[PDB]
Amino acid sequence: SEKAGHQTSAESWGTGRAVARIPRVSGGGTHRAGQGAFGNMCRSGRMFAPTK
Amino acid sequence: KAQIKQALKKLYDIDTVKINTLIRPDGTKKAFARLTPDVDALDIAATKLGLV
Amino acid sequence: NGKVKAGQLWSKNKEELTKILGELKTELSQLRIQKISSSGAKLNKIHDLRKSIARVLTVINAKQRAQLRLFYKNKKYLPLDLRPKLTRALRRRLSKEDASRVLEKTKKRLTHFPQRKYAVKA
Amino acid sequence: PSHKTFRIKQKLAKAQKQNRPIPQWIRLRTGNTIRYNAKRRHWRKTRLGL
Amino acid sequence: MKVRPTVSSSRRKARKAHFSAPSSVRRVIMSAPLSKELREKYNVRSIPIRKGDEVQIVRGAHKDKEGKVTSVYRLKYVIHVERVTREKATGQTVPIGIHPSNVVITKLHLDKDRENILARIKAGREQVAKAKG
Amino acid sequence: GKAKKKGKSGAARNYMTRTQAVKKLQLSLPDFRKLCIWKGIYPREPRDRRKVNKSATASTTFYYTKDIQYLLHEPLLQKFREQK
Amino acid sequence: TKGTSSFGKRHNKTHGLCRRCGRRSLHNQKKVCASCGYPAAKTRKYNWSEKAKRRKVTGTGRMRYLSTVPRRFKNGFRTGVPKGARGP
Amino acid sequence: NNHFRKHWQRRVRCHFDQPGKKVTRRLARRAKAAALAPRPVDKLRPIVRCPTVKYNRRTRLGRGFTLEELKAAGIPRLLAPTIGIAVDHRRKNLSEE
Amino acid sequence: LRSKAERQAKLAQRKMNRMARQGEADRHIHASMPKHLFSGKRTIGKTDRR
RNA sequence: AAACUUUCAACAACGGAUCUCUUGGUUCUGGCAUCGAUGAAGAACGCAGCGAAAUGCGAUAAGUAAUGUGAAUUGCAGAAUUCCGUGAAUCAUCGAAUCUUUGAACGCACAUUGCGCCCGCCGGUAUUCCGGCGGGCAUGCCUGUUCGAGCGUCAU
RNA sequence: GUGAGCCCGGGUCGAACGGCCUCUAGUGCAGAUCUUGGUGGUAGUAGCAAAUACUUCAAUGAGAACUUGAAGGACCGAAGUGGGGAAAGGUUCCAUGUGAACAGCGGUUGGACAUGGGUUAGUCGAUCCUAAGCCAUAGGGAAGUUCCGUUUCAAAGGGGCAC
RNA sequence: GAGACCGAUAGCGCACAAGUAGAGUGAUCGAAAGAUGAAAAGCACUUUGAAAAGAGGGUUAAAUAGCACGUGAAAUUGUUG
RNA sequence: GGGCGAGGCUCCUUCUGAGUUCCCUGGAACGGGACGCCACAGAGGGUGAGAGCCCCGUAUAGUUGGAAGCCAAGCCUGUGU
Ligand SMILES: [Zn+2]
């Protein structure tokens, strides 16, 4: 599906001293919050070059 | 209160002098019906209601 | 006891059905007090009393509606609950007569030159 | 508060009636997967949000 | 090989239908063969099993045990046969579930609905054999 | 309970003057008097006529409000309107 | 004092319960629902929130009348009873 | 010469339904033939000459016969479309051939 | 059967007791990696904490 | 020498990878046209003998009628079914009904289970008082009816 | 076998899998302050030190510093560590019972867990009134969602009498 | 109705009481989580413990399958050599 | 201009072939071996392990019962205001 991996609200936390610059799921109160998104190396992300 | 006293009169031939009502924490209504001094509430509970 | 079948109900009239409904409601009202006072096999009886009350009310409503449909059989305007439901658009649709009405010129042309049955030799 | 509207009290009544553990006979049914009340509420843990 | 477009050979859909079938479908699913004597008497191969039938177990560890059907547990897709039981830890008797396709019916529980079922199945069988012959 | 207001119950609800009855029925005076004679609506006398109408005099005619309500359903009203 | 000390002054309510949609999104001073847009006649929805549309779209609730429509269509919106059926 | 500078992926039309659409068209043709039997499935068309100097060497089927052609053949214009003849009132006969 | 039901009710609590929840109504998911502690830099002007 | 640290092995832990499974997704194809003032979609509150949820349902409330099938349901309890039958069932179908408070939402309102108006019926001593029950009362516009207004144009 | 690897033995295990020739790809990891999950050393370590303070006997109990009764010693010191309310919470209130989990120790105790019970009004509030303010109507804008308007450039209705 | 698609970190966010639990004043954000066994046959009875449990002794084809449950890798740990 | 209409089609309904034969392993044959049978059916699924013949279904013509429509070979009649 063309929307797979992209039905999430996520933004990078920027260059810093602690964590990598992958976009992370915003909000709070759940396990998904702060987790990496949209990447082909990310769990529950979008695959590289999705099949058409 | 008027409906409660009419229903008591229709169901059990019960005459009341006053009826107090409250709404319980679980959402059902509780009614205290004080009977006329001639009748006996213990007799009514023993015979009509079976509350012994 | 406490189980009333619909087969005997379908032959009664309104007065007997109302009288039966009054009895069933009375026994259910007493049986609820007996339930909250003690536990037994009378919970089956309260369940059958509830279903019998439902059956009597259903039969009464059906007989009333049958009588009302017979009363409104030959009338132009009917109650809305007695009118057919279908859908809203189906109700708003043009009737078949109005949809099949044609002009007089079209009727003359169709009368004298309709689509013919024919075959072509090979 | 002690002062409350009827609508608010009705919602509180429904919450009070929902607040319970599951009956123990639920676990003995054929093919049961319910082990506890996963929607159990406590007055110190999660707000009703009214 | 299936031909008709309304027939599906999907394993997923077939297993979903089998394990979520309602009770009236599960009755037909829980069919059992008749014995040789009953087959030659009624011209019927199989029938849905029911409580009160007498069966003989022909598969499993309880083979060659006979008894009346005491329960048709359609929720578990299993029947209970009298004296085909085991002991629990405490020694109390618990029935052992037998699938109906592992038994053979030796004596039918006969009532007029069952005779109607047998008669219409038999009549269909002879009609089909006569038409194909 | 909520406090009742004065003049909202009792004889004020029980009686109606001829003017109020005519305006309630939306009739002319001859039609109203004709209908009252034909249906047996009789004049009534309240104990205190000021409680019913503060401008009422000794020659004010009163009727029962329930009688005028009963007159509202008389089929002769539509006959009057059809003839007009 | 803009953090922990200031959070102690939070005891009012911007939003109450909406009568139409049930959420705690009815602005108590504007009398306008942030979620469904009550008391406007239309239900509030936007194409930039596919998730919010799918949270409240048809089928997410009970479908009390609409779920019976395909069966009535399949049988042709018929009326009456089966021939020889018991009844009045 | 690659025109892929718009959002072209939104408007890609694949044609996996080509055999299914052929089957649907053949079923519709069979239904139309069964409904129209014993009449032919199509209407009679005239012979016309293609326009322009590129294609005027070749003749093909036209839309419908002219009113002058129907008159010279003795077929009335109201009878003609009811016996399988197509009629075109726009076309004229500029030449006798 | 009552003993079996009670044992099943007690055995349903093992994962939540290992997670050390205060009953089944304790379903709080805490922030293990808060953004205010794991993002941004400490500049020379105003800081976010003391 | 032991202990300690490290290395190698066996067993036991920790943890949930691997393998096998799949009533689920994903994509393609084929068929169909059917929401709502005759009150929809959505929301709230309730309903089971023993349920919090999911499911089903609406005070006729895990359901009524009708049709079909033909002996279950099942976790416990309690009852079955005249089994040669107006008939079990958390069955299937579904044309007859019921369908709380709401919501386009419609007497006026609603952060209130607030306040009304009209017409009937019933009950309590009741011409006056009190109570219950039933049916109604939104807006824009169309067609018609009836009641009107204006030296606006006239006739007499 | 140079090698990536291949094959066999032993143990464990429980339902499928492999060789060869072609076809096909979401096909080969040590790194990306990766992604998710799990686990170490640090380490039985840093601490568990504001709010003056605890002690004796008996009972309960498997077990008592933090349970109870009695006996003492102290503190709040009426701008209270007291007696009641508004907001907010929603059963935390009361009785009985209790394994684990929680109460950064301990627990026989508990706002924890389990089963029940508890909130009674003509006179107390709401309900009524208007305040700052907000929204319909007439009417005028605006492609439109809608905007202004709240007394207006509105036929915006009450009463009485009558042979 | 199907597939040279995916096989529980994959495939829809969701194979499960998933747009749920949870978070946010709000608009909105949004998970984790499948598998005992053919059949519960889910351990009678004895014994030690306050209990949880332990040991015998059965059940099973197998408990080297004990509702922490198919298989049970590595990191890391205990004992033994 | 009217009215019949044989017949056909569409949709629900009743019904359909053949091993649980003997031996071995196994807790359980649905495994191995032998002897058969059905097949317009050897698609799929279930049943205590790989089942055409144990069960549901699968193929094919038809065959019970019912309702509403549509098409249609032909056949009766009025005749020109
Ligand atoms: Zn809303």
Rounded distance, CA B43 to CA B49, Å?
9
Rounded distance, CA H23 to CA H5, Å?
37
Q: Please list every residue in chain G whose beta carbon sits closer than 8 Å to the beta carbon of residue C84.
A: 79
Closest nt to residue E29, judged CA to C1'? M56
Q: Cis bond leading into H46, ω under 30°?
A: no
> What Å resolution does this PDB entry report?
2.2
G60, H79, H83 from C109: Cα distances, Å: 55, 10, 15
Contact A14, I40 (CB under 8 A): yes
- Say whether I38 sits in a helix, a strand or coil: helix
G7, two tokens: 């959070």
- Say whether A36 sits in a helix, a strand or coil: strand
Residue in the block written with tokens 């996996």: H16
Contact F56, F64 (CB under 8 A): no
Chain M positions with any atom < 7 A from a protein CB = 1, 14-18, 20-21, 27-30, 41-48, 51, 54-63, 66-67, 71, 73
**C111 at H interface, C-beta within 8 A:** no
Rounded distance, CA I20 to CA I27, Å?
11
Rounded distance, CA I33 to CA A36, Å?
12
- First-last CA distance in chain D: 13
- Say whether C60 sits in a helix, a strand or coil: helix
Closest nt to residue I3, judged CA to C1'? L42
Rounded distance, CA E101 to CA E56, Å?
11
**H38 at C interface, C-beta within 8 A:** yes
Phi and psi of D18, rounded to 5°?
Answer: -75, -25
Closest by CA to D17, choosing from B24, H67, E55, is B24
Closest by CA to G23, choosing from G11, G35, G41, is G35
Residue in the block written with tokens 């020889």: G84
Q: Cis bond leading into G39, ω under 30°?
A: yes
Contact A24, A13 (CB under 8 A): yes
F42, two tokens: 């009789």
Helix, strand, coil abundance in chain H, percent, nearest 5: 40, 10, 50
Q: Strand L closer than 7 Å to the CB of A30?
A: yes
Q: Residue E47's beta-bridge partner residues?
A: E32
Rounded distance, CA E56 to CA E102, Å?
9
* Å separating the CA of residue C58 from the C1' of nucleotide J98: 8
Contact E123, E113 (CB under 8 A): no
Contact E48, E31 (CB under 8 A): yes
Rounded distance, CA D30 to CA I11, Å?
18
Q: Which residue of D has its CA nearest to I27?
A: D45
G15, two tokens: 């939003």
Contact H34, H56 (CB under 8 A): no
H73, two tokens: 């053949």
**Does G18 count as an annotated binding residue?**
yes
Rounded distance, CA C33 to CA B49, Å?
7
**Cα-based torsion angle of the residue sequence F15, F19, F20, F24 in order, rounded to the nearest 10 degrees:** 130
* Å separating the CA of residue I18 from the C1' of nucleotide K55: 40
Rounded distance, CA H49 to CA H54, Å?
11
Neighbouring residues of D20: CB distance < 8 A, sequence distance ≥ 6: D37
CB atoms inside a 10 Å sphere around CB F2: 4
Q: Which helix (H) or strand (E) holds B29?
A: strand B29-35
* Å separating the CA of residue I34 from the C1' of nucleotide L72: 35
* Å separating the CA of residue G7 from the C1' of nucleotide M16: 80
Q: Residue F63's beta-bridge partner residues?
A: F16
- Say whether I37 sits in a helix, a strand or coil: helix
Rounded distance, CA F29 to CA B45, Å?
64
Rounded distance, CA B31 to CA B20, Å?
6
**Cα-based torsion angle of the residue sequence G29, G32, G36, G41 in order, rounded to the nearest 10 degrees:** 160
The DSSP call for residue D21 is P
Contact G14, G20 (CB under 8 A): no
B36, E122, E127 from E132: Cα distances, Å: 89, 15, 9
What type of residue is E103?
V
Chain L positions with any atom < 7 A from a protein CB = 1-3, 9-14, 16-17, 19-32, 38-45, 57-61, 67-68
Q: Which residue of H has its CA nearest to C118?
A: H39
**B29 at D interface, C-beta within 8 A:** no
Q: Which residue of H has its CA nearest to C115?
A: H82
Closest by CA to A4, choosing from A52, A51, A46, is A46
**C108 at H interface, C-beta within 8 A:** no
Q: Which chains touch E (3 or more CB pairs under 8 A)?
A: none
The DSSP call for residue A5 is T
Contact E42, E35 (CB under 8 A): no
Output the 3-class SS for chain F.
Answer: CCCCCCCCCCHHHHEEEHHHHHHHHCCCHHHHHHHHHHHCCCCECCCCHHHHCCCCCCCCCEEEHHHHHHHCCCCHHHHHHHHC
Instruction: Render B2-15 in DSSP notation, one character per residue.
Output: HHHHHHHHHHH---
Method: cryo-EM
Phi and psi of E79, rounded to 5°?
Answer: -115, 160
E42, E119, E123, E124, E125 from E133: Cα distances, Å: 20, 21, 15, 14, 12
